Design a protein around this motif. Structure first.
Motif, PDB file in Angstrom:
ATOM      1  N   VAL A   1       0.724  -1.589  -0.072  1.00 43.55           N
ATOM      2  CA  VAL A   1      -0.152   0.356   0.181  1.00 43.55           C
ATOM      3  C   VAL A   1       0.614   1.450   0.543  1.00 43.55           C
ATOM      4  CG1 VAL A   1      -1.441   1.415   1.254  1.00 43.55           C
ATOM      5  CG2 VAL A   1      -2.328  -1.659   1.257  1.00 43.55           C
TER       6      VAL A   1
ATOM      7  N   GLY B   1       0.645   8.598  -5.935  1.00 47.94           N
ATOM      8  CA  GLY B   1       0.373   9.871  -4.606  1.00 47.94           C
ATOM      9  C   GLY B   1      -1.283  10.200  -4.907  1.00 47.94           C
ATOM     10  N   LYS B   2      -1.250  11.448  -5.453  1.00 49.26           N
ATOM     11  CA  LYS B   2      -2.690  12.458  -5.657  1.00 49.26           C
ATOM     12  C   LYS B   2      -3.664  10.554  -5.781  1.00 49.26           C
ATOM     13  CE  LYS B   2      -4.100  16.829  -6.364  1.00 49.26           C
ATOM     14  NZ  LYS B   2      -5.724  16.716  -6.001  1.00 49.26           N
TER      15      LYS B   2
ATOM     16  N   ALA C   1       1.252   4.377  -3.135  1.00 50.89           N
ATOM     17  CA  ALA C   1       1.099   4.958  -2.691  1.00 50.89           C
ATOM     18  C   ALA C   1       1.802   6.369  -2.978  1.00 50.89           C
ATOM     19  CB  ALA C   1       0.555   5.787  -1.713  1.00 50.89           C
ATOM     20  N   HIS C   2       3.379   5.987  -2.791  1.00 51.29           N
ATOM     21  CA  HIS C   2       4.174   6.759  -3.182  1.00 51.29           C
ATOM     22  C   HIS C   2       4.131   6.838  -4.547  1.00 51.29           C
ATOM     23  CE1 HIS C   2       9.117   6.756  -3.610  1.00 51.29           C
ATOM     24  NE2 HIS C   2       8.744   7.535  -3.568  1.00 51.29           N
TER      25      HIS C   2
ATOM     26  N   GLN D   1      -7.240   3.906  -1.119  1.00 50.66           N
ATOM     27  CA  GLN D   1      -6.867   3.411  -0.053  1.00 50.66           C
ATOM     28  C   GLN D   1      -6.865   2.135   0.180  1.00 50.66           C
ATOM     29  OE1 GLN D   1      -4.741   5.008   2.758  1.00 50.66           O
ATOM     30  NE2 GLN D   1      -4.704   3.538   4.261  1.00 50.66           N
ATOM     31  N   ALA D   2      -8.877   2.910   1.107  1.00 49.25           N
ATOM     32  CA  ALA D   2      -9.646   1.773   1.554  1.00 49.25           C
ATOM     33  C   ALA D   2     -10.302   0.628   1.234  1.00 49.25           C
ATOM     34  CB  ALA D   2     -10.786   2.849   1.987  1.00 49.25           C
TER      35      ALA D   2
ATOM     36  N   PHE E   1      -3.683   8.015  -5.693  1.00 50.04           N
ATOM     37  CA  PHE E   1      -3.677   7.270  -4.423  1.00 50.04           C
ATOM     38  C   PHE E   1      -4.489   7.868  -3.642  1.00 50.04           C
ATOM     39  CE2 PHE E   1      -2.783   4.105  -1.093  1.00 50.04           C
ATOM     40  CZ  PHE E   1      -3.266   2.603  -2.328  1.00 50.04           C
ATOM     41  N   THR E   2      -6.240   8.072  -3.617  1.00 51.03           N
ATOM     42  CA  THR E   2      -7.135   8.388  -2.803  1.00 51.03           C
ATOM     43  C   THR E   2      -8.088   7.829  -1.213  1.00 51.03           C
ATOM     44  OG1 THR E   2      -8.849   8.234  -4.626  1.00 51.03           O
ATOM     45  CG2 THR E   2      -8.139   9.482  -4.601  1.00 51.03           C
ATOM     46  N   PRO E   3      -7.474   9.024   0.084  1.00 47.89           N
ATOM     47  CA  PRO E   3      -8.435   8.056   0.635  1.00 47.89           C
ATOM     48  C   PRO E   3      -9.139   6.810   0.337  1.00 47.89           C
ATOM     49  CG  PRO E   3      -8.092  10.095   1.242  1.00 47.89           C
ATOM     50  CD  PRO E   3      -8.219  10.121  -0.335  1.00 47.89           C
ATOM     51  N   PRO E   4     -10.172   7.128  -0.054  1.00 49.85           N
ATOM     52  CA  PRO E   4     -11.115   5.978  -0.817  1.00 49.85           C
ATOM     53  C   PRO E   4     -10.731   5.038  -1.382  1.00 49.85           C
ATOM     54  CG  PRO E   4     -11.432   7.944  -2.044  1.00 49.85           C
ATOM     55  CD  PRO E   4     -10.621   8.666  -0.780  1.00 49.85           C
TER      56      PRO E   4
END
Ligand code: HEM
Ligand code: HEM
Ligand code: HEM
Ligand code: HEM
Lengths: 141, 146, 146, 141
Positions: free
Chosen positions: C111, C119-120, C115-116, C127-128, C122-125
């Motif tokens: 994960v 970046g942008k 994200a790395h 990621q969930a 990979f939104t919170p949602p």
């Protein structure tokens, strides 16, 4: 971080255990190898059979490290220094195993001291083992 | 969970000898005492100000029996813990949102209660059989988090 | 694992855009670097003396692709992760005896790698949706411990 | 226990983040509530919707506690004293949640600093968050 009451409860527990320390330390290890098999791979060269002299000799070593920890409770980091280096750097013992062993150490005492293993004492010991485990995993390279 | 015949024997044996009216409140009580953060789910039980106050609390003892009833039942259906704990999982996960990891703590506290009560009888091998059970139940109770 | 239609979209979407030849060695490498104790299972890979030495190690990159192949496959069969990872579970649990909890660390490192790289995006949602996948796979890979 | 290299890596990371600290702190919380729903029950009175001013204001509070921790890295126990008391004693925040939030804090940085989030820096930060979390859970009644 180990209140005065905890130190008293742990010290009292240590006294009751008396000379059975080594024997109980060997028992906690056996219990761990049987209950959490994955821990065994850390002792490939050991014979882990029941009554193993190596498990016996080693449970005595663990017991002496815990007693040294309590005998110096206010400064375990410095006292458990060489052991943190050993378990983290050389052995590469993952953190979860300390939780597994602590539980067995607690189960071993509950089984040998019905009088001293009250709810309060159980809680204090758990904090003690948690504190020792925290030191043993402070040195990860 | 799959217990070998000897593991089943070791668990059924000691379990038949368990005082279902006390072991449950003992494990639940110790949990509240050993892992204080769990009291957040029992603000309604009353006085949990001290270990003796927690251990002697009536609601704790009453609720501990239910929890225990849950394990006895789990033991009765090992080869199928999922279907068995389905309903308790919806409650503990979807309604309660019980912090992940709490179910294993209680199983492990249960194990400590079993050792304390049986002593010598709770042999390393007997304990091993129970860690499997406890792990089967904790895993099943957390199926909503899977 | 059961992903809602929007969660499936969020995962398939970003995943289609993943460089399968690098992400895997990146997550495996960071694992070895972030959680050093995991190097005990790779004494054969060679020079893991430094992060750069770990990240640039050929065997790490080679093995990371396999691990990654395992996730892509997991994604392809979410509604049934158990049957899918059955064989990798016997290896990781019965042969390797991989310390409990390591599978979740790697998912979480995965994960972090996602994200790395995105970046942008990979939104919170987003990621969930991936924490569910990672948890479904880690749970499945540990079925031999159930 | 936070080598010199870690302190340098963390301090460098803090610099890059600059004034975005609060914003990123609010983002890590949002990420946690969405990824680990059970954590939400700790904020019953908060509106956790996207763009929530409360989550915004709180992420700023978290960010300032982490900066104070680094600004006093050699003695976090004393600096994070009131917060350990708060989270353990009053809030009853279980230990696992600190792991959940730390991960989100790391995921948040990886997503905003591709250059600084190298393997080494990732490892150092993880140790930093682990150290802060250890302090925040040292005061369990
Ligand atoms: C409170 C917990 C523990 C204490 C106090 C402790 C104590 C000790 C002591 C005093 C030694 C002797 C080292 C020497 O000879 O100088 C040792 C070595 C070792 N420990 Fe631990 N230990 C603990 C937990 C663990 C755990 C959880 C594992 C892995 C599951 C582990 C794996 C080992 C191994 C493999 C060795 C080397 C044995 C050999 O090759 O002879 N230890 N430990
Ligand atoms: C693996 C161990 C556990 C088992 C088998 C278990 C079993 C039970 C049972 C049988 C009930 C009553 C269900 C009903 O009335 O329909 C219950 C309720 C409840 N449990 Fe657990 N439980 C477990 C772990 C936990 C943990 C760790 C917590 C969190 C601290 C928790 C919090 C609660 C609460 C608050 C209730 C009250 C629900 C209500 O009456 O509305 N349980 N549990
Ligand atoms: C959830 C993440 C994981 C996945 C999906 C995964 C996937 C894989 C795959 C696909 C293979 C090759 C299987 C084969 O060749 O048949 C493998 C091998 C292996 N894995 Fe993992 N793995 C995971 C976690 C771990 C962890 C945490 C460790 C422990 C540090 C581990 C240690 C190994 C080792 C040592 C091998 C080499 C086995 C061999 O070639 O004999 N794995 N893994
Ligand atoms: C590195 C991790 C964390 C840091 C540095 C931190 C920092 C803070 C700070 C500075 C406050 C403000 C307290 C005040 O107003 O004086 C606070 C309060 C609080 N924290 Fe944390 N915290 C962390 C993790 C957690 C976690 C993991 C949870 C639960 C999942 C949690 C739950 C709360 C709650 C519920 C409050 C009170 C909020 C309110 O009612 O206004 N914290 N935290």
């Amino acid at each position: 971080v180990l209140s005065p009451a905890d130190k008293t409860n742990v010290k009292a527990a240590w006294g009751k255990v008396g000379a059975h320390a080594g024997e109980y330390g060997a028992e906690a290890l056996e219990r761990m190898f049987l209950s959490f098999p994955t821990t065994k791979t850390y002792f490939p060269h050991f014979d882990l059979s029941h009554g193993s002299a190596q498990v016996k000799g080693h449970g005595k070593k663990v017991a002496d490290a815990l007693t040294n920890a309590v005998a110096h409770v206010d400064d375990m980091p410095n006292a458990l220094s060489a052991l943190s280096d050993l378990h983290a750097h050389k052995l590469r013992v993952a953190p979860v195993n300390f939780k597994l062993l602590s539980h067995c150490l607690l189960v071993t005492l509950a089984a040998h001291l019905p009088a001293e293993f009250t709810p309060a004492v159980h809680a204090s010991l758990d904090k003690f083992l948690a504190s020792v485990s925290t030191v043993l995993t402070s040195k990860y390279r | 969970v799959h217990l070998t015949p000897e593991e089943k024997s070791a668990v059924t044996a000691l379990w038949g000898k368990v005082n279902v009216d006390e072991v449950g409140g003992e494990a639940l009580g110790r949990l509240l005492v050993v892992y204080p953060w769990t009291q957040r789910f029992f603000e309604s039980f009353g006085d949990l100000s001290t270990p003796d106050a927690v251990m002697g609390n009536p609601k704790v003892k009453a609720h501990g029996k239910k929890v225990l009833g849950a394990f006895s039942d789990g033991l009765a259906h090992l080869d199928n813990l999922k279907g068995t704990f389905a309903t308790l999982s919806e409650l503990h996960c979807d309604k309660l949102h019980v912090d992940p990891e709490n179910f294993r703590l209680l199983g492990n506290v249960l194990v400590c209660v079993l050792a304390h009560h049986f002593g010598k009888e709770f042999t390393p091998p007997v304990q091993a059989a129970y860690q499997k059970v406890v792990a089967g139940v904790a895993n099943a109770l957390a199926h909503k988090y899977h």
